[PDB]
Structures are given as structure tokens and as C-alpha cells.
Curated annotation (Swiss-Prot), chain B:
This is 5-hydroxymethyl-dUMP N-hydrolase. The lineage of its organism: Eukaryota, Metazoa, Chordata, Craniata, Vertebrata. It comes from the Eukaryota. Inhibited by AMP and GMP. The chain holds residues 20 to 160 of 174 of the full protein. The keyword Lipid biosynthesis does not apply. It comes from Homo sapiens.
Length: 116, 120
């Protein structure tokens, strides 16, 4: 079973993490936080990020994750009214780095599809 | 002269103040979406120092910081506590006071602290 890393680590994030648990071990002062998170990132097989909300922390985890050569899945909701960053959208190669647009209600159906 | 990379969230007057000061010390490289990404990565690889204004939350600024760390770049993150925001623990904890620095600043001292950083 794969070691999974979930970025930005409320009820929607808990839904993502519960579904992630069905496929593998979800591994997930300030210096200690960073060191602990980078050690988990380094040991992950799949890195999942919910990129709807602008976040320096989520972006930094993705940047380190690409440089660590991990398989990355980004989940974005266009119904939020936001336009996803050109840097995250442009990092997508449709294979080891995918950006999936989704609706709140299809988060379980999409994760099942990705992990099967 | 050295190559300098600047980034900030997509306010613009402050970024122009930072870039205008950066020009004194070197060439500011950064003054469909796949093409934006590749050009940014080439510029990141060419830079000797990466400067990010990290007051405004941004997935893009974060991602460029993540990629710069793995390219072993000299990084300066500028943060304004007077914005009322609390800087991300990830970016705060990424600093080591040497190759990756996170400096708090006030709007009025942006020219003086870039002088202190690049004159050292
Ligand atoms: C490379 N770079 N350069 C500067 C930079 C800021 C700045 C301010 C003042 C001056 C002066 N004088 C010069 C400046 N240069 N910011 C950056 N990176 C930022 C990283 C976060 N962003 C994103 O995630 C983002 C989000 C949505 C769309 C796009 N579209 C996009 N289109 C084309 C190119 C770049 N981006 C990007 C915005 C861009």
C-alpha cells in the first residue's frame, strides 16, 4: 500500500483524507514543523493537494514534491470563483503531475477513479 | 552583474519599489500556462538570488520557493507583519538564516533592508 501525503496538513479536507485512507497510509518550533513535513514528503508515494485556496505552504510543498520526483494530484474547484495559479496549472504534465478540476460532491468518485 | 529573480502575488507599487532597488545590485530576470511555467523555471535556474514578497498568500510564490530550495538558491523572503497576517509556518520554518532567509519588514524600510542584504 502507498504512503500518501496530503498538503495543507475543514470538513471537505476530512472527506478527502477519509477517502485517501481507503488506498494507503496518510502520513499527514516552525523549523520542527518544516523538518517533520519534508521527511514525510520525501517518504510519500503520492502527494495530494487541494489547491482551491491560495496558500504559500501548499505551494511550497508542491515545489519540494516536484523536486523530490513524486506523483502529484492537485484538486481544484472552479465553483469557488477563483482562477487557479498559472504556475500550478502549468506544472501539469497529465501524468506524474495532474490538476483535476472538481465539484464538492464528486470528491469520492474522483479519488476512486485516480487510485484505480 | 548577478541575476536576480523576483516574485509576488498577482500592492503593485510596493513590488515596483522592491524591483527598482533590486536593479542596483543586478539584472532582474522577472521585471499556454505550461509556457509560463517553463519560462519561470528557466529564470529560476538562471538566478543567483531569489527574492519573494511573501505577505500575500500565493500557491505560485510558494511553488517557486519550493523549486528554488531544490535548485540550492540563495533565498530572501520579505514579509510585512503590519498586514495583520501570520506568515505560513511552512515558509517561516523553511528559513535557516543563511541560504534561506525570512525577514520581517515595514513598508518604509524596503530600500534600506535590500541595501543591508546585498551590501553584506
Ligand atoms: C516570475 N514572477 N515575476 C513576477 C513579478 C512581479 C512583479 C512586480 C513588479 C515588477 C516591476 N517593476 C516586476 C514583477 N515581476 N512575479 C512572478 N511570479 C508570480 C508567482 C505567483 N503568480 C501566480 O501564481 C500566477 C497566478 C495567476 C496567473 C499568473 N500568470 C502569469 N502570467 C504571466 C507571467 C507570470 N504569471 C500567475 C504570479 C506570478
Amino acid at each position: 500500500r502507498p504512503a500518501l501525503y496530503f498538503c495543507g496538513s475543514r470538513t471537505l479536507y476530512e472527506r478527502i483524507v477519509s477517502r485517501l485512507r481507503r488506498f494507503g497510509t496518510v502520513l499527514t518550533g516552525d523549523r520542527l514543523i518544516h523538518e517533520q513535513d519534508l521527511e514525510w514528503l520525501q517518504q510519500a508515494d503520492v502527494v495530494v493537494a487541494e489547491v482551491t485556496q491560495p496558500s504559500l505552504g501548499v505551494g511550497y510543498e508542491l515545489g519540494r514534491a516536484v523536486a523530490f520526483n513524486k506523483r502529484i494530484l492537485c484538486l481544484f474547484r472552479p465553483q469557488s470563483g477563483r482562477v487557479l495559479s498559472a504556475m500550478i496549472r502549468g506544472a501539469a504534465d497529465g501524468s506524474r503531475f495532474q490538476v483535476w478540476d472538481y465539484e464538492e460532491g464528486e470528491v469520492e468518485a474522483l479519488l476512486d477513479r485516480y487510485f484505480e
